[model samples]
Target: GSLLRRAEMYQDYMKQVPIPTNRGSLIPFTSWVGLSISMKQLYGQPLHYLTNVLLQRWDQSRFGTDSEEQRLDSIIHPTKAEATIWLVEEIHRLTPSHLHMALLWRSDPMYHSFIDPIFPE
Candidate 1:
């Protein structure tokens, strides 16, 4: 269900849903959409598979120039750590996992005050 949420969030993001964020808080739709694909990749494959096949080829300059596999690591690295930590907590509680956690700012209020704006409700 959470993976579905991730895809749905990316779909909304592609439609240019204006949630909220600081300057540069928004990722380009072209780039953000890759995250949806990444979540599915992660679900269907192993972590090392993506690390070997995609992340190894990622280059910021080649973001749009490459496949979703190549650029996803760069896009997630900044926030994935915090998001993972929070996700583990959620898992421990045995609730529906929120895969969209990767898109949120964990400690950086300067980026956006809201913890999880995509599914606050």
Candidate 2:
């Protein structure tokens, strides 16, 4: 089987994962991953030009990730809201057994490989 077709099947597997819940507040997950990039943003002058070059090079990877991950939030999380609404409607059809409705996003294991990667770890 092609990885394209194989990948799509696994990608569907990704969709079946649930968002983790917290009693305190909601979080899908977010983070900062840059060193010099964050330091300058936070106001730092830690390193000399050698360190300056180090900071500069470290950012070549980190900054590029910021671009894509940031873009996915706008695109992907918007679909998250759509999933919420769609599932709720599906629940409405099934007769509102509210907890199962919430848990609907969590799949049981053929292999517990189901997980979302719209914002990957």
Candidate 3:
């Protein structure tokens, strides 16, 4: 296709990809890669630094050291409202039947791929 045509074609390309279920979309792990880069770029701060700033007041006197997972959550989760909206949008993209199929088949195929062998062993 010509450059102009290709650019025009790509304009609607995202609308073509099937959106994962609301459950999958809301999942923090789903779009984690995109979110990580976004947080760093928008805030002009790396995740660890952001975490330190966020948790500075949480007196370690009562709380233990912050875990790496918690720090990651701070940047990725954003706010409860934002997370809810993201999930709703993702869910709305798919049909009910499609979401059901995704849950039954496409989801968790990798983990279950080795399950039978591991269970027998």
Report the backbone clash tally of model 1. 0
| Residue-wise C-alpha lDDT for candidate 2, range 73-117, written one tens digit per residue | 343353353244334423333343323322332332322222212
- Report the Cα lDDT for candidate 1: 0.34
**Each candidate's TM vs. the true structure?**
0.19, 0.22, 0.25
Error of 3 at 96 (Å): 26
RMSD to truth, every model: 15.9, 17.8, 17.3
Residue by residue across 42-102, what tens digits does model 3's lDDT show?
A: 4332222112222332223324645543443454464552354344433433323333323
Best by TM-score: 3
Model 2 clashing residue pairs (backbone): none
Clashing pairs in 3: none
lDDT string for model 1 (1-121, tens) is 3245643453344334232222222232234225433432333311211122222234344646545454444556635632442344233233322344333323233322211233222
Please give the TM-score that candidate 2 achieves against the real structure.
0.22
Clashes of each: 0, 0, 0
Model 2 stretches astray by more than 4 angstroms: 23-121
Residue 63 displacement (Å), model 3: 27
Whole-model lDDT, candidate 2? 0.33
Comparing candidate 1 with candidate 2, which one achieves the higher TM-score? 2
